[PDB]
Amino acid sequence: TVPVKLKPGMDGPKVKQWPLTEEKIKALVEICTEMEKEGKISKIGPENPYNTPVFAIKSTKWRKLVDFRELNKRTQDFWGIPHPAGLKKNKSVTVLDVGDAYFSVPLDEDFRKYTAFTIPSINNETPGIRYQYNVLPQGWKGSPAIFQSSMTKILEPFRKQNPDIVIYQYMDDLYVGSDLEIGQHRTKIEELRQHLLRWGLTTELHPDKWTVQPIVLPEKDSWTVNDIQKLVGKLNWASQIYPGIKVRQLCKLLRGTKALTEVIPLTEEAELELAENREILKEPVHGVYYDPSKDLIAEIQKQGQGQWTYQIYQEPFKNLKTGKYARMRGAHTNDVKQLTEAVQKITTESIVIWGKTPKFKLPIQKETWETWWTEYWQATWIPEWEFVNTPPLVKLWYQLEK
Amino acid sequence: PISPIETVPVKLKPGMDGPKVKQWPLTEEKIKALVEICTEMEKEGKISKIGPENPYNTPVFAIKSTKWRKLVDFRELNKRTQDFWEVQLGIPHPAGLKKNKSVTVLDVGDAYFSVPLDEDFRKYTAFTIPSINNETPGIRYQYNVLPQGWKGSPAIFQSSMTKILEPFRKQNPDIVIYQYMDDLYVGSDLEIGQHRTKIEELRQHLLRWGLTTPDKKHQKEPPFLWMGYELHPDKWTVQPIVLPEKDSWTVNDIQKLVGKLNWASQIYPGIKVRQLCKLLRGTKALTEVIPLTEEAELELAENREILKEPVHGVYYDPSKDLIAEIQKQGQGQWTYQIYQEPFKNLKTGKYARMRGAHTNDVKQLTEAVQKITTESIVIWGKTPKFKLPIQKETWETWWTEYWQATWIPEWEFVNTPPLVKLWYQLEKEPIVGAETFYVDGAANRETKLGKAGYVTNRGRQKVVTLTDTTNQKTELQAIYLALQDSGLEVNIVTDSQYALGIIQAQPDQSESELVNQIIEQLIKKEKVYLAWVPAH
Ligand SMILES: Cc1cc(S(N)(=O)=O)ccc1NC(=O)COc1ccc(Cl)cc1C(=O)c1cc(Cl)cc(C#N)c1
């Protein structure tokens, strides 16, 4: 075992366990009695005051999902593999779960305490069941790192055999990228799983298709005072990104106090202005480049009717990427599901593109989100998030996307 | 007979050191009692007489069977001990107890003193018995077991217990043992005699580890007294809450009262404390005597009558449905009852009017649902099917269009008035023909002087000069004018970033009178179309 430590002066996580369902507790209890036996985890005493949250996600088979977000932050660094720029340009990338790989390697006995976690009980009819990892834990940043030599090794043979195929490791995940056609691709992935499987491992993005979508402005036979106002508003706000966007000629048409419903005729100068503004918006703002030393920020607005809009940026109005996400079959009566779904999606894109997860600003109240985000979580990692109050215009502007 | 229980590794906080506080001086009497006690505890094996090889010290005290007892103040040692995983802070709510044929309560007794101290750590617990009136060298000891009052005792004890029971719970899957502080509430569905025997088994399992326990000699008999509750074999009920009648009510008095009444509101239907609370206005001291108004004297009466009602509940049966029903008792106030079979309530409660900056009933309904859900998840590990006084149409129409992620788990409509609705809906498009007010307000934030008028396409005009206003009241006041001064159909355009707010959230209750006034107005119109245009 390699000695690991917490970053200077940082103490261990002491996050509280959120209450779980009976359904979920019985599952964690099962999974944990197993792992206990196999020596992967051991019950612990009260002298260990640390703690991390644990939950169960979805076969009928339930998986254990620990949230080491705090311990990850408190965990020393190790200066992972450099992001492969081409991954983004592949025709198809597959994600495989190699968290099972860690259970092999032991965890520096001195660090264990910090991995303590608790399985709660309905009605507090009992204290929780406490454990701490004896081996590398899935979801801990120091796991894939500490297993890096061992990982590369097991990987080479497959890379050389197929050097037109790229493989990138983020936490427990393996993103495999090629240009082969679907069938030749997937069959070749299984050729990779099989390869992985003869040690102890186990289990469909199209990056080149993710298009950068522009803002399209409304087109009308006739324009009313209202139409022009709304338009002049979107443009105004937008002048914050593209400063060449002008609303003088338009804002002129609006002089006077006439019924919103009245039709205004468009002056030729006004028409150019619009035309000129459609031209400016035809491409993303220039001068936006990714800086690896800065955080990634992912903001989302609920467009309603199951549509969602998002922007990944580091500097306000200097967007790295933007998108919309329309609800998936089945989530009709569920905002929470579409959101967690959108988040997982956006977060994977970010991993694919820059090899790091973005920090999220979510338009949902903390209680609602904390009470139900698990029910639909499906990834091994967990981004960082904060709850916010959607400014009505950033929304209005992006619903204007093509 | 203490314990063959493996000790727990206790260490002192980051790099600190054991206590060294000087022994408080005591009388020959008090001293002679402490000597007595410690001599007993010396033999029970609880403490050990030590010597000069201990710089550590904690102050012992003598307090009064009126017989002399002792008290060691570990305040220091505690603030210098490591931190432990916090012992269970959440307490079971009867409604979450599965009805069992028999239940036994076993308080573990000589709890702490019965469990081993980490032998390393004992030194830190050394205290000293003073000599006759502060003249030199008295008796010195240290603890061999969890000391009463030391920081880790509870957590250490809880653990040891949990460990000792792992086997039993393993071999008796259909037996249920709740753990709470030093108590074991043991319940099963065996037969009165089978049960009785299994309890004696447990008891004997524990004794074989150092934990004495009750016999039918001392061991509580139902109903069980437990936090404002009475636990009967087939129902729980609330223990009588008595409002003392007096002719002199201090501020302290009326507060403690208002408090017991507020707690009562959760269980009893109809409690009210409006006129009571009214008595607190302007009070100059807790001891102040404030004469009860008539209104006050009356509600207090009515409460005395509500309170003498037999509210009771049932226990949880895992095989039946969980159902929570909500009622809106006044703006922002909600009542709920959670049951399985009709009228047979498992739990009830209400949520106080959450006076916000600005919300609407559907939002608050939503929040009461959130609270109930978490409460339920905790208590039963499940989430209720809901019965809500709201039409699925209103819900869909609201949620489906609210800027924020929202949600209600599975629920069904129930028409139990009043119903929660949307007090108004702003128009989706400008209203043809309907007047078009162009509103505005500007106020010297510094002078708090302003005006807020409008000019419609139709000629009608106005402006008012206002005293005491930050542009935000003008703006809103602007809009307010435009609302009163128009027909049941209007189009109002503004530059107010705050009005844009209303647009996206159409609130039906706020902190500010203004917003209220406007809201009132919005509800009166048949159609309103609010529009925002950039300022300048
Ligand atoms: C009250 C009662 C009496 C009897 S009998 N027939 O033995 O008198 C049988 C079951 C029950 N109870 C039930 O059916 C449901 O309740 C329970 C179901 C299981 C268990 Cl282990 C305890 C209780 C309790 O009554 C209880 C719970 C706590 Cl947290 C504290 C105290 C406390 N203090 C008592």
Swiss-Prot record, chain A:
<feature type="binding site">
    <location>
        <position position="172"/>
    </location>
    <ligand>
        <name>Mg(2+) 1</name>
    </ligand>
</feature>
<protein>
    <recommendedName>
        <fullName>p51 RT</fullName>
    </recommendedName>
</protein>
<feature type="domain" description="Reverse transcriptase">
    <location>
        <begin position="38"/>
        <end position="205"/>
    </location>
</feature>
<feature type="site" description="Essential for RT p66/p51 heterodimerization">
    <location>
        <position position="372"/>
    </location>
</feature>
<feature type="site" description="Essential for RT p66/p51 heterodimerization">
    <location>
        <position position="385"/>
    </location>
</feature>
<feature type="binding site">
    <location>
        <position position="173"/>
    </location>
    <ligand>
        <name>Mg(2+) 1</name>
    </ligand>
</feature>
<feature type="binding site">
    <location>
        <position position="97"/>
    </location>
    <ligand>
        <name>Mg(2+) 1</name>
    </ligand>
</feature>
<feature type="short sequence motif" description="Tryptophan repeat motif">
    <location>
        <begin position="369"/>
        <end position="385"/>
    </location>
</feature>
